[PDB]
């Protein structure tokens, strides 16, 4: 069974960018629900229940028809939020190989940011914006609801290894930013954990 | 060009069921944006910019490929919310032909409510839950994002004439109910305008 991971920081560790109230509800209520639903759906599937969540979502097409959607949504929700919590932290600085790779594939850090912000703002409805590694090149993509690039293009309409991502579901920014998603996206740059991003870039797996 | 319709009541007229703050933001910010974006896209389509919004969304396939999506989302958003505001009011009572039709197609008012709540709660991500009239029969369906049954099955995955609907985007209930969509759905029964629903049922068009 999957366990709801604890946050690696206080619920107000991201202030004044991301509000403490949202962090708490988002983690203990929203993420918790995805974990519960995912575990309930895996109760009778011992074969898949043992796999890590990141791997399970790469094998959705191998699940019984009546289990595919529930797990896509909830196991997806669990995987995405787990990555999200670890991808946040104040005080980091983009540098090293990751920075070089970004300037290489986007021309500059500013171009990249503009491209990322555009993808995040243009995702209509619920979804996520991602910086993925497709082989040797970095790219910005977005997915709907709780889909992940790890699920493959046939399912999510996107592919690649997630380096970092931004949750654009309204529950992630409505309490503080209301309808102003652009303001939320701007604040994100202040809390994106570049150290974690660099680590994932180095691992590539 | 479309214009934000004025609400048929004060922003606090639905208290203590739907909060005043959300009503105000939902109307003056969210709905306003759909209206603004739909007008921006229609500036270049004189032959469509004159059609009533409910009619425009039935002709999405006749639009230029690069306009279909933007109008589907924004004209859809405008049509759905316009219907939503008129479908809310305290103090009404389900009765007459509509009530008979519901008991006829659902067995009872309670079965109908249970079915509606299930559709509204099971819509993953952003969307709407609807009570539609199709083939002389009433049915409960749901759509994603700002899609409407009026758009047709090929586009929205649903069809029929909307009698009443419930907005299940998180911006419609997060401030007061947070993650508890079920509680929000329950409060809805206290503010659904049965008079308007009956009127639409009688019109059938
Ligand atoms: Mn989330
Ligand atoms: Mn809405």
Curated annotation (Swiss-Prot), chains A, B:
SUPFAM superfamilies: Fe,Mn superoxide dismutase (SOD), C-terminal domain (SSF54719), Fe,Mn superoxide dismutase (SOD), N-terminal domain (SSF46609). Gene3D superfamilies: Fe,Mn superoxide dismutase (SOD) domain, Iron/manganese superoxide dismutase, C-terminal domain. It catalyses: 2 superoxide + 2 H(+) = H2O2 + O2. It comes from the Bacteria. GO terms for molecular function: antioxidant activity; DNA binding; manganese ion binding; metal ion binding; protein homodimerization activity; superoxide dismutase activity. Keywords: Manganese, Metal-binding, Oxidoreductase. It is an enzyme of class 1 (oxidoreductase). Mn(2+) binds at residues 26, 81, 167, 171. Its cofactor is Mn(2+). GO terms for cellular component: cytoplasm; cytosol. InterPro entries: Mn/Fe_SOD, Mn/Fe_SOD_BS, Mn/Fe_SOD_C, Mn/Fe_SOD_N, Mn/Fe_SOD_N_sf, SOD_C_sf. The keyword Oxidoreductase applies. Its EC number is 1.15.1.1. Binds 1 Mn(2+) ion per subunit. Homodimer. Belongs to the iron/manganese superoxide dismutase family. Destroys superoxide anion radicals which are normally produced within the cells and which are toxic to biological systems. NCBIfam families: PRK10925.1. This is Superoxide dismutase [Mn].
